[PDB]
Amino acid sequence: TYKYVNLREPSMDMKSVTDRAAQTLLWTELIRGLGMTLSYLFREPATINYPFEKGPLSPRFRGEHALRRYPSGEERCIACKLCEAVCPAQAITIEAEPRADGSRRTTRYDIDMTKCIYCGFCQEACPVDAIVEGPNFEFSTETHEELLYNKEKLLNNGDKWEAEIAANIQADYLYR
Amino acid sequence: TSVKPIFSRDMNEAKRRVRELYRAWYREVPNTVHLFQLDISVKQGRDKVREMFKKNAHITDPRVVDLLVIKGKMELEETIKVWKQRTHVMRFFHETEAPRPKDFLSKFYVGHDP
Amino acid sequence: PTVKPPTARKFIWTNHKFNLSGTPQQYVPYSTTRKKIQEWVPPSTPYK
Amino acid sequence: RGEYVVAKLDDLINWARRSSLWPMTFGLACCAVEMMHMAAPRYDMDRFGVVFRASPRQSDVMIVAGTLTNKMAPALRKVYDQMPEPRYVVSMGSCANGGGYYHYSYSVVRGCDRIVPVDIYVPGCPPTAEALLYGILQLQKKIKREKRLRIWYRR
Amino acid sequence: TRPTVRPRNDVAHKQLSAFGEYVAEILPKYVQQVQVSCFNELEICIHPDGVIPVLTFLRDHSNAQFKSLADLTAVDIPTRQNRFEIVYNLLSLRFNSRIRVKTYTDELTPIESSVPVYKAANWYEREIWDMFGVFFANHPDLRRILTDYGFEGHPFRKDFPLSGYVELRYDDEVKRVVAEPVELAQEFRKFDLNSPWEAFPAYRQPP
Amino acid sequence: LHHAVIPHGKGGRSSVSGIVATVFGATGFLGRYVVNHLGRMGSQVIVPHRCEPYDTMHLRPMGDLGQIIFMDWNGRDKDSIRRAVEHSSVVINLVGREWETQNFDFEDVFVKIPQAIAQVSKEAGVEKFIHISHLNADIKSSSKYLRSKAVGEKEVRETFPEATIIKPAEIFGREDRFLNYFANIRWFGGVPLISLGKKTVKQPVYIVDVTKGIINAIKDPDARGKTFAFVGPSRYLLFDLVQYVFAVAHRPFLPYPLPHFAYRWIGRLFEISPFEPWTTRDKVERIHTTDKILPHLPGLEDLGVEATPLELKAIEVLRRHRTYRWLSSEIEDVQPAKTIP
Amino acid sequence: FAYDGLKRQRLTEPMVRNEKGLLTHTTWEDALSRVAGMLQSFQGNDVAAIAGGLVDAEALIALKDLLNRVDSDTLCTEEVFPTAGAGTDLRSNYLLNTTIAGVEEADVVLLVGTNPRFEAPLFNARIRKSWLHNDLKVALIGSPVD
Amino acid sequence: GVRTSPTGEKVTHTGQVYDDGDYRKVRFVGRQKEVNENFAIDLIAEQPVSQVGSRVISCDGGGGALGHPRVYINLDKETKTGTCGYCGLQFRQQH
Numbered sequence A: 001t002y003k004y005v006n007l008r009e010p011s012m013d014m015k016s017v018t019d020r021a022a023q024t025l026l027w028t029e030l031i032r033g034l035g036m037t038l039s040y041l042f043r044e045p046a047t048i049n050y051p052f053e054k055g056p057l058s059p060r061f062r063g064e065h066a067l068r069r070y071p072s073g074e075e076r077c078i079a080c081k082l083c084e085a086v087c088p089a090q091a092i093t094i095e096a097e098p099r100a101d102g103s104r105r106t107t108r109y110d111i112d113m114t115k116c117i118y119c120g121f122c123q124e125a126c127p128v129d130a131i132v133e134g135p136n137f138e139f140s141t142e143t144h145e146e147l148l149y150n151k152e153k154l155l156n157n158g159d160k161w162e163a164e165i166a167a168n169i170q171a172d173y174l175y176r
Numbered sequence B: 001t002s003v004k005p006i007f008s009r010d011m012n013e014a015k016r017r018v019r020e021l022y023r024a025w026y027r028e029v030p031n032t033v034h035l036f037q038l039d040i041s042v043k044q045g046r047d048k049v050r051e052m053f054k055k056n057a058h059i060t061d062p063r064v065v066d067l068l069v070i071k072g073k074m075e076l077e078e079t080i081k082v083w084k085q086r087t088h089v090m091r092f093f094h095e096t097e098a099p100r101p102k103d104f105l106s107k108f109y110v111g112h113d114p
Numbered sequence C: 001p002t003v004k005p006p007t008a009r010k011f012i013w014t015n016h017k018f019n020l021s022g023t024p025q026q027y028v029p030y031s032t033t034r035k036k037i038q039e040w041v042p043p044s045t046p047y048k
Numbered sequence D: 001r002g003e004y005v006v007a008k009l010d011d012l013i014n015w016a017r018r019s020s021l022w023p024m025t026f027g028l029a030c031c032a033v034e035m036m037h038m039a040a041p042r043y044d045m046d047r048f049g050v051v052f053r054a055s056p057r058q059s060d061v062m063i064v065a066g067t068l069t070n071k072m073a074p075a076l077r078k079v080y081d082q083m084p085e086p087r088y089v090v091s092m093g094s095c096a097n098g099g100g101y102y103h104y105s106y107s108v109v110r111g112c113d114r115i116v117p118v119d120i121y122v123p124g125c126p127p128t129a130e131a132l133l134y135g136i137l138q139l140q141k142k143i144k145r146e147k148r149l150r151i152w153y154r155r
Numbered sequence E: 001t002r003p004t005v006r007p008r009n010d011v012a013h014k015q016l017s018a019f020g021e022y023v024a025e026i027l028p029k030y031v032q033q034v035q036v037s038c039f040n041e042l043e044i045c046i047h048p049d050g051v052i053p054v055l056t057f058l059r060d061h062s063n064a065q066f067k068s069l070a071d072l073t074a075v076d077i078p079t080r081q082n083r084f085e086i087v088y089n090l091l092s093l094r095f096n097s098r099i100r101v102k103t104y105t106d107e108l109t110p111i112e113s114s115v116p117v118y119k120a121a122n123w124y125e126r127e128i129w130d131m132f133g134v135f136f137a138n139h140p141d142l143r144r145i146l147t148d149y150g151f152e153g154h155p156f157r158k159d160f161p162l163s164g165y166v167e168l169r170y171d172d173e174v175k176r177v178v179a180e181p182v183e184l185a186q187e188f189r190k191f192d193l194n195s196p197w198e199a200f201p202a203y204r205q206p207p
Numbered sequence F: 001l002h003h004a005v006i007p008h009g010k011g012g013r014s015s016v017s018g019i020v021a022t023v024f025g026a027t028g029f030l031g032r033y034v035v036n037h038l039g040r041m042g043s044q045v046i047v048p049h050r051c052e053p054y055d056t057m058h059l060r061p062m063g064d065l066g067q068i069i070f071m072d073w074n075g076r077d078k079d080s081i082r083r084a085v086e087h088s089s090v091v092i093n094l095v096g097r098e099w100e101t102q103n104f105d106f107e108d109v110f111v112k113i114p115q116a117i118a119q120v121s122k123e124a125g126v127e128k129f130i131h132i133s134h135l136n137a138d139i140k141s142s143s144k145y146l147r148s149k150a151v152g153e154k155e156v157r158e159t160f161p162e163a164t165i166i167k168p169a170e171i172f173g174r175e176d177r178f179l180n181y182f183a184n185i186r187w188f189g190g191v192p193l194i195s196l197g198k199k200t201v202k203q204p205v206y207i208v209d210v211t212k213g214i215i216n217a218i219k220d221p222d223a224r225g226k227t228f229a230f231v232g233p234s235r236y237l238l239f240d241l242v243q244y245v246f247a248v249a250h251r252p253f254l255p256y257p258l259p260h261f262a263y264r265w266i267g268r269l270f271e272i273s274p275f276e277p278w279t280t281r282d283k284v285e286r287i288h289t290t291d292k293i294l295p296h297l298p299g300l301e302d303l304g305v306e307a308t309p310l311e312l313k314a315i316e317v318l319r320r321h322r323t324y325r326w327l328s329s330e331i332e333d334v335q336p337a338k339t340i341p
Numbered sequence G: 001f002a003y004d005g006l007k008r009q010r011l012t013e014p015m016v017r018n019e020k021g022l023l024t025h026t027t028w029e030d031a032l033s034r035v036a037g038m039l040q041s042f043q044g045n046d047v048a049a050i051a052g053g054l055v056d057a058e059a060l061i062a063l064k065d066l067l068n069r070v071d072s073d074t075l076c077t078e079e080v081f082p083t084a085g086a087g088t089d090l091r092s093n094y095l096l097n098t099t100i101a102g103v104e105e106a107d108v109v110l111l112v113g114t115n116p117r118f119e120a121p122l123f124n125a126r127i128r129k130s131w132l133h134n135d136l137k138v139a140l141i142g143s144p145v146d
Numbered sequence H: 001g002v003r004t005s006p007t008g009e010k011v012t013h014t015g016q017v018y019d020d021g022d023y024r025k026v027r028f029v030g031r032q033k034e035v036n037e038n039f040a041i042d043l044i045a046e047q048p049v050s051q052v053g054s055r056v057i058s059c060d061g062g063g064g065a066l067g068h069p070r071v072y073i074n075l076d077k078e079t080k081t082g083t084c085g086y087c088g089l090q091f092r093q094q095h
Ligand SMILES: CCCCCCCCCCCCCCCCCC(=O)OC[C@H](COP(=O)(O)OCCN)OC(=O)CCCCCCCCCCCCCCCCC
Pocket: A024, A025, A026, A027, A030, A031
């Protein structure tokens, strides 16, 4: 089915022809348009008072990256390199070797935050919930180099944001 | 060895097209130096034009020559209509590039590239 | 968090920190791996 | 005391400059949509004194909002150069920050800081409108820290 | 009745097969191959000499009426002596059908411009010339459309490197943007992903 | 060589040149060209700056990520100097003013500061030290600028005996205070010259030539403990040179003699400016000082640099001084000035 | 498994003896100049060379030509071969003429003064393959190694 | 634990630290070197060994689907503990 958006024949009776004459000379349809912007003047605006008020987000939000630990404090990351393989932007760089004990752990874990597209494939790919995108979106920097995160920066992010991150995973993991 | 031609049936027709393009470029250099306000001289512009024609002087395939002339004409139309900017016109001169050595010993010291 | 407090971990920061960009305590990137090739060290005595 | 006077005069000019930032009407790709959302009613950048103006002659900030190609690079440099001073650049999003997801492309400039100096780098693909607004406020605090007249005084 | 498997439509397959040979019967001078895919798309493989006759017939014939050129593009297959495959995707509103017409060429052989048949082809052919280097004869205005001015090479060729040969930066000494040989602070990491076990026996090639 | 400073790559932006240079006075006319050239090939550059960070923004695009490092410093504090040089292999000193201020004078910037940088650099084990003096440095010179250059040049030589000292003539370039200085005299109508500028000979040198000479001195092992004189290829009478400047800028040229005492009196008048003086008495003396001939010293050719003639680059500097009517004039319209064999 | 020896004890810079008889890093230009200066002052028997076990043919021929241009013929290897009789005149005198794959066609193998297990492990595996699948007879003159 | 190199630079949990004469440490002058102080190798070693009464035990890291893939560990050797290859928790057989 279709409909016509603009296929009208206007009435030619005297009343309709005078109603259009008054509209042309008295600008009635232009005054009607003033009424609508007047009605907005007296509405409450939609502005929020940033940074005192914040735009609503959900637990799924994809923000700054972090590397997480188990409750014991051991790193979750096992240097499987699945996040590095799936990264659409090739933003992750990883090196690994046996730790001083026998553990399989990374020696390099970099994210070029200026290559990253914040797509979240890395946290989907991770089998142990080690790499996540956190809820933080207020980390703009004065230099480019400050956005090339090494493993120390990402572990600090996890230690900094774990309290919020764990609660967000708790809200969403049954959808995953 | 029977193939579909582009513009020239043989190398003598192709060289006629090459000479014509050289004239158009030769006439244009004085205008290009003026419009784009280049700090090179007209001789430098014409020397560069000559240099670009001589790097291809060994072609013997009229279809290859036809394409180089085709590309050379698009290159010229970009310049005349000022679709190019000063940066594009000056890319032919590689001003910021340091001279790479050509002798063996100089290559040997810097690195491994042949 | 008053009604639903977060889960306490030993490794979680006790003191939150704001954005430190542009300050002496900003983040500076570096390579976290060790040297990969060891260079030979010549003997410290003469013998030639 | 000259020290006290120049200190106060920096506050005056710094306050004027950060309170009346006029970004160039300049956007390149996806990230320009989030910039439009920062002008929209919810965030209303204009309420901070941040007003878009089209002419580079009447602009204080270039927000590089999107991918910079090699074909567009001379044009971006041209309009930056035509800004009167003082002028600032905000790099918005992964593309402008360091090439992003077209980083290895033959036609893409790997970061707009190869072409212009950059004051603030806003991460994201795209940064949320609020993330950009955070970046603008970070630029305001940077301007608030400028010591032009104090440095002039001690020259 | 198989929730995960895409259903077949054998009616559309039958109809497209009949039309495919109908085109082969009318244009035998040019048509080299006709095939219909398992998801019901009809492809006509023609000699490049027949681009104008074949496209004109499909547009104008009363049983064709492919009045719309949806897409025109090229594929580069270096292992073929005619490495470039030119692909025309046409749509017929009258019969609610689509058809694909394909031909071939190399780096030195020109293909006739189809702007006389479809004015939509003007920019599609400039893009093919720009990204592949295929020359279209009698084009009203053939020049680069996507690459930077003065750009050298045809990036969509398989042997053109992903990051190209030159990169740009602003140089303060000359006060302009300059082009210089490309160096990457991090080289793109080539991945070898293909599994060494065959996945689809139906497409196995004779040894 | 420590493994981190072995050269790698092809001498481009992302390469590793192996040079860790601390450049003092990088935010000036010469500094921006030195930093640019060092950055082009992938050098690590430390830029200690006194100015406000907005004024270093033009340096940031000159290096790959992490290659340009900025520090704060004060010429009178040696802790700040030592922090900026203790990781470097070469220290370059480009510090200088063309005028004195209430806080720093010619002795301070041309003797005390260079000596302190050389002194701290030596204590920190810096191996290469490049110091920019002046061709016309002389203790018998009228100008305190040139007298201070002679003292500082001597001082640096004892403090850092392996220093490479470079003595340029006036440097012409886009941001120079030489060709631009002459062109901006048009705002006063005629061009005053002491004795009409007929008793002065200049040998100006191109900025890029000087920059390449400094870069080549870093790499060349012969440059240690040497003194170079960087001069242009041709010598000109000051009258012809100023006349040439106005010919290239297409501005009316109305020279007229002005005696030294009267023109020294104009210099002090302009010295009242609390900002950057348009001209000073010292500048008036330096402009009219004939450029010395020092055959015993090595020059640009000893560093593999071909001095660029003034005639090939004046339009690069002077085009912006033309009115709209004459903006498009090409490099071939103006006849070269008379030289001196 | 020996590739990790490529990561350690590596020569990465030219080195010459300083003024106290100790090796110190220098540039290629200085290092080659000293050698070239000494090369130009000697001839004939005064110049010799020894090629080790991991040298490539390109280096071997380049070094032979260089010493030849000062009329030196003393190009030696560390590994001895008897030069009596034909010596190295005939390739067949110093080659594995049957080829490695030829072991699989042999019916009797005589090993003389060789522990092929450790001297050529993949050659010993070919012998065992024949010993196993072809009933090959192997005899040894030498130490009764395993 | 976070040692400090004789220069004073902190050593990371990967053992990284610029040596003396490495120019690259200039990048930390007037700034700081980012080092995570919670070394995972130390923290995991503070977990007590768990006594179990069977030859084989399973570990999923705790928290169900929030942990790691479930693996089964053999505890037959009495000269050592059984370690989880994912999370490093240790198990021993109770006699
Ligand atoms: C007894 C004897 C007495 C004799 C005298 C009796 C005569 C009385 C009646 C005479 C007619 C009165 C109106 C005359 C005013 C002009 C009217 C007019 O011309 O408007 C029509 C004009 C044309 O537009 P259009 O319809 O596209 O074209 C018509 C066909 N070509 O369209 C327009 O002009 C539209 C203008 C567009 C811009 C409008 C933006 C502002 C709109 C809000 C303004 C509100 C007015 C407030 C006035 C403030 C007063 C201080």
